Structure 1
Amino acid sequence: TELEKKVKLEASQHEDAWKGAGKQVGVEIWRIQQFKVVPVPKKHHGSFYTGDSYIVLSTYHPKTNPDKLAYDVHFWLGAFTTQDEAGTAAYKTVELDDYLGGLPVQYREVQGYESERFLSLFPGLRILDGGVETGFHHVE
């Protein structure tokens, strides 16, 4: 497990999307786009395409110490997201968890059934039609 923790932690270093993540209190958002973790522009934070999957890292101060950083890592699955997108969001959520030393607590969020913890991140939560096309090649 210590060797498994080392191998997984090393692999997490090869994802540019995690560089700078979890540095300060706030909400950071990425979208899965044809298997790639793409940061969502701040002006779009809180808006989620029904056809897509996302990763939302909430960094906050825990009740046990106001000068420390704690992490809730949610991945959000749109009602019309494709399997490649949801599966990549799931795996990359574990990867970001590894990248941050296992500290984050993982939450699976689906459109319309989101936890209150997730809903409390936005004053502000708008579902948009459409989404980026799947990364899958369809086998005829």
Structure 2
Amino acid sequence: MDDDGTGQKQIWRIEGSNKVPVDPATYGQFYGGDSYIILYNYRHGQIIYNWQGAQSTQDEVAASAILTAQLDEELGGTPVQSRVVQGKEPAHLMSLFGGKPMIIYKGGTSREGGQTAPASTRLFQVRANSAGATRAVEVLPKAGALNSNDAFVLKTPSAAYLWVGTGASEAEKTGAQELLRVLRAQPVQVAEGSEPDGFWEALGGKAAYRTSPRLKDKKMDAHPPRLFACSNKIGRFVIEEVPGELMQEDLATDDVMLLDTWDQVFVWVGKDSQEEEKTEALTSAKRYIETDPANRDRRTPITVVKQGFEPPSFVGWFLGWDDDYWS
């Protein structure tokens, strides 16, 4: 099976000890700190997506998995279950919104604290991938959080803007607006490298963000960056490509990562990694090149970054980072 997404769908959101419905007019939006269940009827059986937000607790996740099964049972167990974790949504689940972007807010109902309060002034990193799939992830309203390769939205009850990075693509331009409407306010369409003095004020700080000649290249949609996991945990060195969208989670604290942005290759060493792992990663990074489609630009720099000390030119490739994460 696989259709538009234009079909009829029902979305729930495991709150405390119950799967409570989600206002149909906000279907698109989700709280990255909770778990949802969504029933979708194709356009020809059904399928249930158990979407587990990145910051949702075990009690929720566990709950959300049980209710997904119980729902499947209740409907005669004909529908298909599909567990998806934040950031790794399948193309289809991603289309259940007529083309609107998938918005993901900070927080959610930590049942023993209830629904958290929006903000006071917030920012979103709006990124999309090859197939146009777009995401708007809420991030801390800091200058250091911007990425020349995406479009951001800065709502600040005082004001509000729609910053658009050099390399930002249409999809992100579009979805950037959709997010503005969705929750309310008119921008101040500002492009990168020519921004007002009061945009920098919303962020309250100075700037110096995530940027690099590759990040600023709007032709990335040719050689997309790729993340590799390099581990020798099984007794031989092996490299696995990291599917889905590059997220801070994807970095194996246990091993050595390869972030090949074509014009350069970051070798990311996990804190608890192994020297032999780093070595072979390098040996390989240096060999991925040379076997070069000569499309392989001259002598690409190989750079080494240690866990917890990654530079902006590296972090700007991960959908929503979190300085405090491995701590």
Q: What is residue 73 of structure 1 aligned with on the other side?
A: 48
Partner of 1:85, secondary structure, is helix
SS class of match (1:42): coil
Q: Which has the higher contact order (CA 8 A, sep 6+)?
A: 1
> Which residue of 31, 46, 70 corresponds with 1:95?
70
What do the CA deviations read for 1:86-133 (whole angstroms, capped 9, x no partner)?
111100000110111111100001111111121121213111111100
- Contact 1:84/1:134, CA 8 A, preserved across alignment: no
Which structure shows the bigger proportion of residues in helix conformation?
Answer: 1
Q: d(CA) in 1 for partners of 2:43 and 2:27? A: 21
Aligned residue among 107, 110, 114 for 1:133? 110
Q: Aligned partners of 1:61, 1:120: CA distance in 2, in Å?
A: 13
For 1:44, the aligned partner's letter is T
* Alignment of 1:105 onto 2:77: no
Q: Normalised by the size of structure 2, how large is the TM-score? A: 0.31
TM-score with structure 1 setting the length: 0.70
Q: What aligned pairs does 1:1-140 form with structure 2 within 5 A after superposition?
A: 25-62=7-44, 70-122=45-97, 123-124=99-100, 125-134=102-111
Q: Matched residues in 1 for 2:77 and 2:27: separation? A: 25
* SS of aligned partner of 1:107: strand
Percent of matched pairs sharing the same residue: 43
Is the 1:27–1:56 contact (alpha carbons within 8 Å) kept by the matching residues of 2?
yes
- Cα drift, residue 73 of structure 1: 0.4
How many residue pairs match? The answer is 104
TM-superposed deviation, 1:134: 4.4
| Cα distance in structure 1, aligned partners of 2:109 and 2:21 | 14
Say which SS state the counterpart of residue 89 (structure 1) adopts. helix
Partner secondary structure for residue 102 of structure 1: coil
CA distance in structure 2 between the aligned counterparts of 1:116 and 1:108, rounded to whole angstroms: 13
Counterpart Cα distance in 2 of 1:108 and 1:102: 16
Residue 76 of structure 2 aligns to a residue in which SS? Answer: coil
Larger radius of gyration: 2
Aligned partner of residue 34 in structure 1, secondary structure:
coil
Name the CA distance, whole Å, in 2 between partners of 1:119 and 1:91: 23
Residue 20 of structure 1 is matched in structure 2 by none
Question: Where has structure 1 moved over 3 Å in runs of 4 or more?
Answer: none
The answer for the alignment partner of 2:234 in structure 1 is none
Q: What is the alpha-carbon root mean square deviation over aligned residues?
A: 1.2
Q: Is the 8 A contact 1:82 1:134 kept in 2?
A: no
3-state DSSP of counterpart to 1:108: strand
> How far apart are 1:35 and its partner, in Å?
1.6
Residue deviations 1:59-86 (CA, integer Å, cap 9, x gap): 1233xxxxxxx10100101100000111
- Cα distance in 1 for partners of 2:30, 2:19 equals 15
Secondary structure of 2:12's counterpart equals: strand
